[PDB]
Every structure is written in structure tokens, then in C-alpha cells.
Amino acid sequence: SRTIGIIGAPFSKGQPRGGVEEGPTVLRKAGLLEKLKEQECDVKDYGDLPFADIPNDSPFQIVKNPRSVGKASEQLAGKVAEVKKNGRISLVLGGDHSLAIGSISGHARVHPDLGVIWVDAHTDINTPLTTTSGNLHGQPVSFLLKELKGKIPDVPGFSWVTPCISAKDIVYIGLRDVDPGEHYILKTLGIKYFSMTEVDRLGIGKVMEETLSYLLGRKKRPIHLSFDVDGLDPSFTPATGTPVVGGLTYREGLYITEEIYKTGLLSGLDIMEVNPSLGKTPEEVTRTVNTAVAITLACFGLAREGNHKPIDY
Template sequence: MALLCHTRSDSPGSGLSEWPIVAVQRQGQAEERTGAALALGDYEEEAMKGCDPPARGAAAALTVNGSCFARLLRKQADAGLQLPKPAHSVALVGAPFSRGQKRRGVDHGPAALRAAGLVERLAGLGCQVYDFGDLNFTQVPNDELYNNLVLYPRSVGLASQVVADAVSRAVAAGHSCVTIGGDHSLALGSVSGHAQQCPHLGVIWVDAHADINTPLTTQSGNLHGQPVSFLLRELQDKVPQLPGFSWLKPCLSATDIVYIGLRDVDPAEYYILKNYDIQYFSMREIDRLGIQKVMERTFEQLMGRRQRPIHLSFDIDAFDPSLAPATGTPVLGGLTYREGMYITEEIHNTGMLSAVDMVEVNPLLGASQEEVNATASLAVDVIAACFGQTREGAHIAFDELPTPSSPDESDREEQVRI
């Protein structure tokens, strides 16, 4: 594996362009990259028209009815139709932010995932990985409560703006963007930044919690439980203007998001899900339908009428705590390992995945180093499955089987005996 390191500082204050860039490529597959080619601002605007990076040059959008969308994608690929191919250029963005909630340690999540081998795993799948390091977040002094309840609004708002800029620039440059947190409030920025380049994106939100409280319905005051309410257009008359949030504009409609794995939903959140007709699959639905049917219905909802980029926002607490103990708000009865891998494998198979969030890994909350390692390794498995890792092994390019260069010695001995 070759490590190509470049440092850029040509655009002060522009976010990603100031960070050290580590490009990781498989040995023997490295290609020449100039500094200009790595600049996240260097891309052709014409290529971005239509805001569908994974589908550039693809055939016209498919119209699919029924619940067999995922299988139909495979059949069309087998038939040789021109379908979007998964991007193999991955921008890794660390977001060590913790002020969307009260517990210390979640800001160490990016370091834990890197230590668990995330970069090397993606490179081993044939991805070209550009690790842009961790974002820097400005500390806001005297960040007073909003409405005597909501915590750190200015800190969350400003940090989310930094994340939005980073993700927008990464997607604009043609990368699939992987944002590693950090708490789930960072999705305010990652989804917003993604939508700046791809306004018609669809979001798959895998989580034990709906994260759709408003600042006026929250019981905890934690903004990591509220990001979706700020992102939905239908809720804007219910969401007050928080200090630090003036930059944020709603970018999703209720039909643009599907939840998977819910099992701890507040009363106001349940009201929103039902009255705004938001598609969700609780663990009860997963038990009743099975994960295959859940994914078929998810793709039917988001991509049944047209193909579009997918944003996967994955909270590690979607898994059962027996698998992911090092997290801040564990809830019993979560996803199994097989269900979690199936979700991400199927998303990868669409060829439309454009951005991923992996959040809420908290190394300080594991009862032992083994629990921390297990949680971080699970998060790495999820991300790897998004980029082609399968449970029967990594399916990288393999052209042909080798043939012997000379007759086998045993054959020669047999001929002598005869």
C-alpha cells in the first residue's frame, strides 16, 4: 500500500484545502496526482449540472414500480445496461465534535476509527482514500442555553457550518465523502453540505432514535436529537431561529428520508413521523418484515421514480448494545451484525451512495478496551461494506486465474513410470 502525502495551504480559511491530505492507494494501482488535481475547488462546473455525481454519464433515470428495485438493479447490471458505478475516490473527513450532547468522549471517535484501520480497510477495497484529517471547531465562550434548555446552540451551529463546507467541497470534487464523528448533530452540516451539490438527494437514517425533536419539543436539550427537524422543509414553521443557525436552510422534504432501526422515539417525534408521513422502519417492523423487505421498500421510497444520490447517516447505536457498547445512548433490541451489514451492502449495490456519516462512537464509554475496540471495529465494518466489502470477502478486480508455466513435476514422474 502506497501512502502519498500532500500538504496544501493555497486557500486560507477555505476549510478542506488547508488540511494535510493523505492519499492512500493500493500498491501497483497508484496514478499520478498533481497538487492541482487534489484541490477540492478544482472541478468543472458543467460536470456538476444536475447534481448527481455518482450518475454522471449514466443512462436516463429508471422508473421502477413494485418492491423489487434492488433486484432489478442487479438484473440490469447483468444485462450490460449502463448504470452508475460506485465512486472509488473517498474523502475522509474527521468531525471531532461533542457539544450536541452532554457526555465527554465522542470527540475521540474519529481517532478511534482511524486506529481501527479504517483508511487501510478502504484502500484494501481498491478505493483511493484522501484523509483530510480532522476539522477544527471554534470554541464559543458563554454559549448560553436557548429557551433555558437547548445546549450549546452557537457551538453546534458554527461547527455544522464548518462540516457543511467541507462535505460540499469534497462532493463537488467528485469524492464520496465519509464524515466520521463526533455526535449526530454533525449531520446538520453533512446533509446540508451534500445537498448544496446534490439538491435531490435521498437520506437513509439508521439509528435507534429519530433525532427529529424541535427546540420546542426536546426533553433533553441535546441538539444531537434534533438535526432532522432543521433539515425538513415541512417543519420550518415549527422550528425557531437559533443563534448560530442563520446559515442553515432546510434541504429535505419528508419523502426524502427513510429511518431504519428506530426503538426509542419521543412522543413529539412520533407525532411528526405519523402526521408528516415520514417513512420509518422500527425494530418491530424489521422483525416482522425482515431486513430484505425493509431495504426493498426503502429503495422504492427513495429511488422508485428516479435514481438520485444517497446520503447514509449511520448512528452506531442502531446496533444492539451487545455489539456496540461504547456509545452514549444505547438501547436494547437493536440491529444484529447481519442486519447492519445487509443494509450497507444493499446501499452499495445501488451504485448511488454519495456520502456517509458514522457517528456516536465514544471510546470513553466502553467498560473495557475490548468494548471500545469492538465498537470501533464494527463502525469500520459498516463503512467498508458501503464501499464493496462483502461477508464472503472483498470483491476487487480479478481478471483471470493463473496457469502453470511448465508441466507439473508429478506428471513427469508418472510418465517415467509408464
């Protein structure tokens, strides 16, 4: 049926603030598994990946914690590939977005033809040479693009990496805080994106129609959804590291996911950047987690119009 495989990934060295390691814990203790089991979902939790501490991981130029991040993704890519072989949609509950490198890589090992939908207020496509922060949660995409392969230096811990996607297989939704170098890359590789500008102009309805018509226009390949919690407006998911105002509405958030689910092609999912310790109040924490959970459930069947199990009431 709608089989899922849960991958907790308590990692945070992809950026400065540490609380995101707890993301898996809080979402789990929010009742996610239970809630998913309450749907036609066949759920199997593969546990929280144990991330060995790499004490010796000095900066690579300005790129911070490279070996730590590379291993974290290298380990995850393998676990992802495992559940995908067990015929389950991989659900990655993580910390920072840098894990996307491991998530998508391993997912591709199984389904190379996959298409990606990246919901985020940022493009996370900086390169070790374009980034000015050195924080890897803002560079995952660059490591995954084939077009870029050959303009990215060998970063300690990323030798295991192989560019599993071309510009033509990814769509962004939500952008509102993009770097100049990031912008240049977009227009140059002609990447499909819908910034808040396009959403405002078109409506989330058209936005979703086009994005899917874009990725599934030709063949009907498996879908990977990388959802960075900061894609939604801070008034919904405040407990996040890099929030930007003017974000996606809670309703738009649900609309995106309700539509992905209805395609029947959701192969992989990432719920990133949920940092409970950045909530200025116990409720901002609750609010953030709750939304993260609601969005996840929509990915797996939950519909605002209602749902009904096969029987005469």
C-alpha cells in the same frame, strides 16, 4: 471509480458526555484508511476539522451549546460541499449526531435531489420546542425538513441553515426509542420509517428492498446514509452515548450497508456516536470500533460472499 473523501469531525457539544470527540482518532488508528485503500477505493483524507471553542454559548431556552453546534455544522457543511465537488463520496467520521445538520446540508448544496437513509434507534427529529433534554444530537432532522420550516425558532448559530429536504425524501431504519412529540411528527408528515417492529415482521431483506424502492422508485438520485452507531444492539456497539436494547443485529448492520453500496448511488456517509470512553472495558471499546469499521467497509465494496479484482487467478 469508488472515490472517497474523509472528513474527521471531533465534535461533542451536541450532547452531555464528551468522549465522542475521539471517534475520528480511534477509527483512524483502527486502520480504516489503509483498509479502504485495500479495496478498489480511491481514498483522500481531508483531515480532522478544527472546532473553535465557543466559551460564550449560554442555553437557548433549554437548547444547550447552540452556537457551538451551529458553527460546527456550518463549517462541516462547507467542507462536505468541497469534497462533493472533488467528485468524492464524503465520509464523515464524527462525534455526536448533531453534525448531521452540517453533513447533509453541504451534501445537498451539491446534490439537492438527494435521498436520506437514517439508521438509528432514535429519530433525532425533536425541535427546540419538543425536546425535553435540550441536547442537539437529538434534533438534527428537524432542522433539515422543509415541512417543518416555520415551526422552528431561530436558534443562535443556525441562521446559516436552510431546510434541504422534505418528508418524502427520508427513511428511518431501527427505531425503538421514540419520543411522543417525535412520534406525532412522523405520522403527521407521513415519514417513511421501519422501526424494530417492522424489521422483526418483515426481515431486513424486505425492509431494505422497500426502503430503496421508496427512495429510488422515481428518479435515481444520490444517497446519503446517516449511521448512528446506536442503531445496532448494544451487544455490538456498547461504547455509545444513548444505547437501547433490542437493536439491529451485526449481520443486519452489514446487510443494510452491503445493499446501499450495491446501488452504486452512495453519495454521502456519516459514522456517528462512537464514544470510546463509554466502553466499560477495553474490549467493548474494541468491539464497538471494529463494528463501526466493518460497516463502513461494507458501504464501500466489502462483501461477505467475497470480492475479486478483474483477473484470472
